[PDB]
Amino acid sequence: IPEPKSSCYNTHEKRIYQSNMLNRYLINVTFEGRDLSFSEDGYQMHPKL
Amino acid sequence: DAVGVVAQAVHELLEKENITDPPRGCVGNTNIWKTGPLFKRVLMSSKYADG
């Protein structure tokens, strides 16, 4: 699991790490019974209106 | 060119000049300055022909 960035601005001089594929999975997560699969393009799926 | 635009904008700003300030300072004045969009319409409506 990754680690917190040392700085919001100064870590940039040393921000040398892997490429995070978070959304490749983070979009797709659901628990507590209610399903919350997300969308790639940046919003929800099955929104309650 | 751009400073000529802002020049043409300024002496037209006196026609309304109800801005009373562009809010400065960091904290506290969290409100959209009530003439931002209007002054922007003014500035983008600046007509000169020599730059």
Binding site: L26, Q44, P47 | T30
Partner: protein
């Protein structure tokens, strides 16, 4: 990991009472350590100041946030913020989320609300089921 619920100048001490919940399951949940730092109705500069300071205060590996404001800009501000350290952000109580069309290339941010296509879809369903 470090998670916080920042509060921008509201009468929502309901949040102060909120986070007392229970869904402990056999998942990773390695370090769920919530944080509740409210603020006054402040400016984006101080907003980001506290944002990445508190991010750097104890720990941060994922952020949530809500506020009470009109639909103006706070989401866009947070959106840029999301980029500069590769971190997820989930705006909620969408006075802080009137969704934006475009997104930066590699920003892990998301927000709630409907996609405009979905609004079209629902309004068409309404138009449908009453036969005009």
């Amino acid at each position: 990991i470090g998670i916080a619920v920042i509060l921008v100048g509201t009468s929502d001490e309901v949040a102060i009472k909120d986070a007392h919940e229970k869904d402990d399951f056999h998942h990773l949940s390695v370090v769920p350590r919530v944080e509740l730092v409210a603020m006054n109705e402040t400016d984006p500069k101080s907003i980001i100041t506290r944002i990445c300071d508190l991010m750097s205060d104890r720990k941060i590996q994922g952020v949530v946030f809500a506020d009470d404001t009109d639909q103006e800009a706070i989401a866009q501000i947070l959106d840029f913020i999301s980029a500069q350290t590769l971190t997820p952000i989930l705006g909620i109580h969408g006075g802080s989320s009137m969704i934006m069309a475009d997104k930066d290339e590699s920003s892990m941010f998301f927000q709630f609300g409907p996609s405009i296509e979905q609004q079209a879809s629902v309004m068409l369903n309404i138009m449908e089921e009453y036969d005009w």
